[PDB]
Amino acid sequence: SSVVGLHYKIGKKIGEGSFGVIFEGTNIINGVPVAIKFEPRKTEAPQLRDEYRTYKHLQGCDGIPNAYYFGQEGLHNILVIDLLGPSLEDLFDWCGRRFSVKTVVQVAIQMLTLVEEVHRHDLIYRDIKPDNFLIGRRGATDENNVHLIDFGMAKQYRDPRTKQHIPYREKKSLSGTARYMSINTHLGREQSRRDDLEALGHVFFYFLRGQLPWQGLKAPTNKQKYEKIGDKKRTTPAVTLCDGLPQQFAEYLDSVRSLPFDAEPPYEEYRMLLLSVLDDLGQACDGDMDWMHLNGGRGWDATINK
Numbered sequence: 001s002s003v004v005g006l007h008y009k010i011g012k013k014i015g016e017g018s019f020g021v022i023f024e025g026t027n028i029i030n031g032v033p034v035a036i037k038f039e040p041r042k043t044e045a046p047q048l049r050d051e052y053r054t055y056k057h058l059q060g061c062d063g064i065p066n067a068y069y070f071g072q073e074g075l076h077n078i079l080v081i082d083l084l085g086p087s088l089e090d091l092f093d094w095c096g097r098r099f100s101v102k103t104v105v106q107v108a109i110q111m112l113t114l115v116e117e118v119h120r121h122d123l124i125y126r127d128i129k130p131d132n133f134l135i136g137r138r139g140a141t142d143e144n145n146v147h148l149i150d151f152g153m154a155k156q157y158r159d160p161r162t163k164q165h166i167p168y169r170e171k172k173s174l175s176g177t178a179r180y181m182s183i184n185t186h187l188g189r190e191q192s193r194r195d196d197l198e199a200l201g202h203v204f205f206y207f208l209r210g211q212l213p214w215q216g217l218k219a220p221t222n223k224q225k226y227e228k229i230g231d232k233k234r235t236t237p238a239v240t241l242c243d244g245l246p247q248q249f250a251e252y253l254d255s256v257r258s259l260p261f262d263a264e265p266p267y268e269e270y271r272m273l274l275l276s277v278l279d280d281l282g283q284a285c286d287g288d289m290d291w292m293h294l295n296g297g298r299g300w301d302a303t304i305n306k
């Protein structure tokens with residue numbers, strides 16, 4: 001039968017692999033587009049139901065999609081959420097694998113705002129990467145605004161009522177993708193708010209430079225490869241990353257790398273820091289992004305770009 005969750009008809013597939021399947025969908029009551037996340041029921045990595053709960057806790061926060069339904073159907077588990085646009089990694093590719101300073105600053109402060117609100121709801125993200133930051137859809141009011149999806153690695157870092165930080169521990173298994181993960185994550189340390197921020201600084205340099213100096217490294221195994229990547233992150237000073245770039249980005253990475261384990265980061269201080277880049281270069285934070293000039297001004301095309 002075409003319809004799951006009583007009201008959500010399944011359309012084209014937009015992703016397959018370990019995430020069971022992800023589909024396009026439409027609400028059969030109002031026609032609004034949704035994304036249908038299927039997950040095999042009896043599997044060794046059950047994660048969807050908690051991702052639905054996380055969306056419900058973060059419900060209403062701007063930039064976080066709504067969760068409309070979760071339940072059992074067949075031998076699959078379904079999460080229906082707002083369908084959104086391409087990831088920042090997609091637009092990165094289409095923009096020639098480089099964002100200009102204006103776009104990076106504007107995108108950064110929205111990522112700082114999203115992650116902040118996540119922290120306000122007592123959770124750390126722990127999977128920061130450009131592939132999990134999506135823009136809206138054509139014609140929508142939030143078309144070129146940054147969103148945050150995929151919360152399967154979100155963990156509670158403080159008690160919601162007492163606001164008391166989790167204990168510091170070590171010797172944990174390496175969590176996330178090695179290109180953006182913080183240095184503390186490489187060393188197997190318990191993550192916190194600071195690590196979500198340090199991973200953003202890595203993403204910011206990845207947008208500005210088009211690559212990171214610890215990409216394309218070789219090693220016999222993945223354990224040794226993750227260590228070589230972690231090794232160059234500590235060998236490479238923030239100023240060398242920021243070569244020919246506004247030093248506020250090096251200043252940002254250094255300041256969040258120095259944050260104590262339980263310290264609350266000065267989010268607005270970081271946003272003002274990156275905003276002062278635009279004042280230094282005589283630019284305005286008006287919302288104009290690089291991808292809004294693709295294809296002659298049209299935007300991004302489904303079969304040329306992707």
Ligand SMILES: [Cl-]
Binds near residue numbers: 221222223224
């Ligand atoms: Cl090994």
